[PDB]
Design a protein around this motif. Structure first.
Motif, PDB file in Angstrom:
ATOM      1  N   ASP A   1     115.304  57.499  98.834  1.00 14.39           N
ATOM      2  CA  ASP A   1     115.623  56.402  97.926  1.00 14.39           C
ATOM      3  C   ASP A   1     116.771  56.902  97.050  1.00 14.39           C
ATOM      4  O   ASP A   1     116.606  57.863  96.293  1.00 14.39           O
ATOM      5  CB  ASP A   1     114.404  56.072  97.057  1.00 14.39           C
TER       6      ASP A   1
ATOM      7  N   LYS B   1     108.539  59.664 100.937  1.00 13.73           N
ATOM      8  CA  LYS B   1     109.855  59.247 100.460  1.00 13.73           C
ATOM      9  C   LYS B   1     110.191  60.033  99.199  1.00 13.73           C
ATOM     10  O   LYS B   1     109.362  60.165  98.294  1.00 13.73           O
ATOM     11  CB  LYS B   1     109.882  57.742 100.145  1.00 13.73           C
TER      12      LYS B   1
ATOM     13  N   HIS C   1     108.009  46.778  99.413  1.00  7.22           N
ATOM     14  CA  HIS C   1     108.079  47.661  98.270  1.00  7.22           C
ATOM     15  C   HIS C   1     106.703  47.588  97.619  1.00  7.22           C
ATOM     16  O   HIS C   1     106.084  46.521  97.572  1.00  7.22           O
ATOM     17  CB  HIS C   1     109.167  47.184  97.313  1.00  7.22           C
TER      18      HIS C   1
ATOM     19  N   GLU D   1     114.661  45.191  98.579  1.00  7.50           N
ATOM     20  CA  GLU D   1     113.594  45.716  97.729  1.00  7.50           C
ATOM     21  C   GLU D   1     113.338  44.837  96.490  1.00  7.50           C
ATOM     22  O   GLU D   1     112.189  44.622  96.113  1.00  7.50           O
ATOM     23  CB  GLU D   1     113.939  47.145  97.285  1.00  7.50           C
TER      24      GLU D   1
ATOM     25  N   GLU E   1     117.519  54.098 101.542  1.00  6.77           N
ATOM     26  CA  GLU E   1     117.188  52.971 100.685  1.00  6.77           C
ATOM     27  C   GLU E   1     118.009  52.931  99.399  1.00  6.77           C
ATOM     28  O   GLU E   1     118.368  53.970  98.834  1.00  6.77           O
ATOM     29  CB  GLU E   1     115.687  53.026 100.340  1.00  6.77           C
TER      30      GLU E   1
HETATM   31 MG   LIG Z   1     113.200  51.897  95.625  1.00  9.28          MG
END
Ligand SMILES: [Mg+2]
Ligand SMILES: [Mg+2]
Ligand SMILES: [Mg+2]
Ligand SMILES: [Mg+2]
Ligand SMILES: [Mg+2]
Ligand SMILES: [Mg+2]
Ligand SMILES: [Mg+2]
Ligand SMILES: [Mg+2]
Lengths: 377, 380, 380, 377
Positions: free
Chosen positions: C205, C171, C308, C258, C232
């Motif tokens: 993200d 990510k 998370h 999250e 995200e």
């Molecule tokens: Mg995050």
């Protein structure tokens, strides 16, 4: 009244194994000796045991008890009777397979008594011929992309040579191809088959995430595949709705289901385009009739799952003529499938002419056991 | 580095044992580990149909013998084993009889896993904050189906006995073959309620005698004053839309799913049937593991769960453990020896939970705290 | 009659230990039983705010000290204890910071309960049918927020390193203070995707830099060809209706939750947010016990769960056990020592799970298989 | 095959008037002289003209054309062929009445060829007896309350004497009674009949405001009537829905509708508890079977409208045995009705015993024209 319409005298479940292909022939005989043939799915010995249990109470009765003594012509009534008396353990699952086999035999028996082919007991027909789609699968390892494609290549060429209007190919279970490789695989097969023949795909339940399946299906839209079967797990109806809402492929469901009640849920909750309820699993021809008329009103096609013996195949042709609401129906042909039971258990074999079948002329399902073949197991 | 528990040993065998009594029968499921330690559970359905199902031969990915996927596994991984068995048997066990067999094994795993770890079964389901649980008892007198006066006279002593023993709730039934008009049923229930009084909750089992929701609605609405706890088996079991109609047009609690299997059918009863209470059975729907998923789902949707229970002391033991750790309702179905006929129910297993003041205290023995009474079992 | 396990002893004390490093910090939660055996877990939130919360004085039914309801309970009854703690703290702990504290205790109970019974934590969550799990790794280079070329240059070596170690998924983030136009973000992600290649899954993200769903939709739709795994933190965390819009007008997986707590907020994200994936955190939302309920609920609604995770090795251990027994997705968030900066993350606890070929093998040690590295901890 | 199953040779529409009362007999004869009887609703001369139009194009065909030459056993197939070829002017309304008469006749004919009662061609039955509800109406002036109540008095008592399990009373069309007077009227009738006998009520479409009807129906809830028929105008489906949503009475609909398409609307949009599609209007027994199986799935009862001659009454008994899903069904009995046509047109009359009919035994519908009465014109 017609004397030939005699009450059922007996019903026996006959396991047939061949060394591992098998089935459970259902023979229903009236007091005059005339009999009908059908078959049930599931482990033969489990089915035989279920078929021979002792009645205990109103909802736990032996499946054959409610049929013995009844007139084979009252197929709808006999179905209701058997179902009601077996609710404790036969409303879904294995128990329904046993009921299916009997329902099937009744159409063959009723047909012989009245002297008419089974499809005339299902409403008659306005079609002059029906066309099946054939499920093809080569004798391959699960193998590799190359082996699989090479193994399919000829079955596909043979299908086109015989003018088969549609064929279904499968993605090997034990295969470990990524979705990117599955797309390639399907592109290669479609490449071999050409676009003049419809092509269905059975993914054999290799997926669990609708999103990944949607990406795959949306990437091979150009292949104009007829349908996508067994994509997500069979219990994941909400997952199937996601596929319908996010892709343009026909999504199938209910291949392993039983009864019109599960079928209704696939339609409304699964939002599926096509139901694959099986002749010898869901409740026979009688339940497939109710399922199909319900499906039609809801713009859902029905192509009953079919991979058993000549007994179901015969029922399949009759279904398509009087009840079917789709262009094709699943059929397993001896020249496009290995398997002795399918090949020799019953006779005669319907004649496929230019990818289609003509209307049945013989009484009932128009079939009988190959005593010779059966004589050897 | 710390060594793991030695008692957590692989499963070595699984045996299905039919037990008939002359009818009364069940299918005992015994799971034995490497060290000879075992767990007991039981499956619903014709014992010989179940026996044959439990001995089928594996044919392909989705048509496997149910025990195969459990053999060799550590009993403590009940949830994983449940999934292993389910996935491998989809071809003929997703619903119906096949699930009865899976149910029996799951139940046995809680008993076995409990013995290996040395803890009562309910502690493997999350523990409890309750000190006692109170079941409702299903009553049915020996009456031939009987008539109004016959049925009432027969129920009277059972209802007085329950009040005497301080049973918090009881369930009565409308005899199957009774041809009482809906108005006679209303009278019937008013009489029973009159005998019982209003300090004891009264549930009613209609034994699927109806098929028209409107008629049933008229019935239940005419007896709101009786304050019955619930209306069970009113419409046919497949008639989910019919149950919805009942819920929408009456103020009685409507039950469903007594004969269903899996959380998938349970979910449909909740969303489509709109029922207030699910009755999925321990030995039918998927055992304690599936009942846990069904109950947590039911709670989120404001639906109570009182698992159907009418077998032997094996399921009765499971029921107590269930109610302590999973149950989300004030009562749960239980069949008590002193309030029923059933040698199988009374003698098959020992010991018997002690009902004190209409309630059960926390189980203390490992697993389900039960075992086969070989003398009884040996006496055929 | 069979005696119960002697190791299952009552909890004697619960201690919250803040740990700062000079910033990097966490709150270690240590639960010790009668015999001195203990379990480790950790809570999110300002360590001193959490410390004070963990030491408040009980005032009434709904305003109790969080540890009070756990003390004296058998660690094996994790679910019951969770309910006991939740109910007693409703006045100020149903959501927000208070749940962080409850999360830490729940996590510790799995570790402790595991040690008493001598089994790995995942076996208390149901066991597994998986032989290995594969996490996605969150990468972020040391870059000042930086600019396009600066950010790309900084990510390059991390992405090559991940490919070299066979990491199945990673990510990347869009730097917070970066003022890149949405078109620059698209370019940015195309560059990273180009460096990484398409055999490795790439999650993104966005660090809550957007507030208009339409703008975000235009962005995600413009980069479908990148085949990113998910998007995200696109819109503000309270904007559930906005996420719904994204799901309805794009084909990207949209994440949510999250920073949420409890299964109640998770359910809202599912039904109202319509998100494809929940990111509820182990040390925030209610620990492993609540993550189990959230995940089973998520699965029924075709929603993946990738908790998370950016704390110390305590949560990392919990994450592996979670993925083996509860996880319903192909990956799960994990922060690896060789792919991040964080002395606290690298040294606080030992041992460290061994990532082999981008995957983790089944844990074998009791509980969470971890412990405080006192030397590091003593070095302040 | 079965030599008796021969192609249809001709189809005749025969108007029958009485000096008022009338009907249209439908006679379908096969290539052996064997025939089946049925009847169609509507102006006899309009129906006859419709049955004799000339085919113009694919969708505008003579109704009998697609049946002539077909085997009468294929009733479902013939139904589709007729419907499809007449879509231009026969999908709804008058045209369907004609199709209905032919469909009915096919069951009688097919039953004779195979030598079985009509109900066996509809699935058979598990019911030993069926019980109709009788529609009663005295020969009264519209009259005043007293006069109307007086006429119903003897009929009601006679119904109780014959142990009729259910009866339907009507509110005179031209009666200018207020809603309060109609309520009084029904209370008085319920008092005379008693509660041991079910009572249905036909309001003959005297209302247009659902609110007013709700008030009336909610005020007589204590009479526990079985249903409220023809309360609001027939096109007012949304209005019937409001009735269902605001009262606890069973609400009926579709009395004058045709096809399963209008019936579906009544179910889903009208939200009605019971459908009254007529044998001789909506598409005959074949369409009533589809309607009923659909109705059952939606928890809706079906009691087909029936007020013609013994031909429809016969079809009704057979329907109830194999297809019916409700405890009663409409029937007009000679000892409770005043119609020379209903009494003499066909023979024999089914024997009503203790409020019920026994399972038919004769082939087909078991009726035939009374030549004498007919010769009397
Ligand atoms: Mg995050
Ligand atoms: Mg398939
Ligand atoms: Mg439609
Ligand atoms: Mg019951
Ligand atoms: Mg809720
Ligand atoms: Mg779902
Ligand atoms: Mg009328
Ligand atoms: Mg329904």
């Amino acid at each position: 009244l017609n004397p030939a319409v005699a009450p059922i005298k007996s019903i026996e479940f006959i396991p047939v194994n061949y060394q591992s292909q098998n089935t459970v022939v259902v023979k229903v005989t009236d007091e005059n000796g005339v009999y009908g043939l059908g078959e049930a799915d599931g482990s033969p010995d489990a089915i035989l045991a279920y078929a021979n249990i002792e009645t205990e109470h109103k909802w736990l009765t032996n499946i054959t008890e409610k049929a013995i003594g009844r007139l084979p012509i009252e197929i709808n009534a006999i179905w209701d009777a058997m179902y009601d008396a077996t609710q404790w353990q036969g409303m879904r699952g294995l128990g329904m397979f046993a009921l299916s086999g009997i329902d099937m035999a009744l159409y063959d028996l009723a047909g012989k008594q009245l002297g008419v082919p089974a499809y005339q007991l299902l409403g008659g027909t306005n079609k002059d011929k029906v066309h099946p789609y054939l499920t093809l699968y080569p004798a391959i390892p699960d193998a590799s992309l190359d082996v699989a494609i090479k193994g399919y290549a000829p079955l596909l060429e043979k299908a086109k040579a015989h003018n088969i209007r549609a064929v279904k190919v499968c993605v090997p279970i034990k295969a470990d191809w990524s979705t990117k490789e599955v797309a390639y695989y399907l592109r290669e097969l479609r490449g071999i088959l050409g676009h003049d023949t419809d092509m269905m795909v059975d993914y054999l339940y290799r997926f669990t995430d609708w999103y990944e399946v949607a990406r795959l299906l949306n990437s091979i839209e150009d292949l104009e595949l007829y349908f996508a079967e067994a994509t997500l797990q069979h219990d994941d109806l909400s997952g199937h709705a996601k596929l319908v809402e996010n892709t343009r492929s026909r999504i199938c469901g209910a291949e392993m289901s039983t009864t019109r009640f599960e079928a209704e849920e696939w339609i409304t909750k699964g939002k599926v385009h096509l139901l694959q309820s099986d002749y010898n699993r869901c409740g026979g021809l009688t339940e497939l009739r109710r399922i199909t008329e319900m499906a039609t009103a809801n713009n859902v096609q029905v192509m009953p799952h079919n991979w058993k013996t000549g007994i179901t195949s015969a029922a399949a042709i009759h279904y398509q003529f009087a009840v079917g609401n789709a262009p094709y129906f699943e059929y397993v042909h001896p020249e496009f499938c290995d398997g002795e039971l399918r090949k020799y258990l019953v006779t005669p074999e319907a004649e496929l002419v230019d990818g289609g079948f003509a209307k049945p002329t013989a009484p009932g399902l128009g079939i009988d056991l190959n005593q010779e073949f059966l004589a050897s197991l």
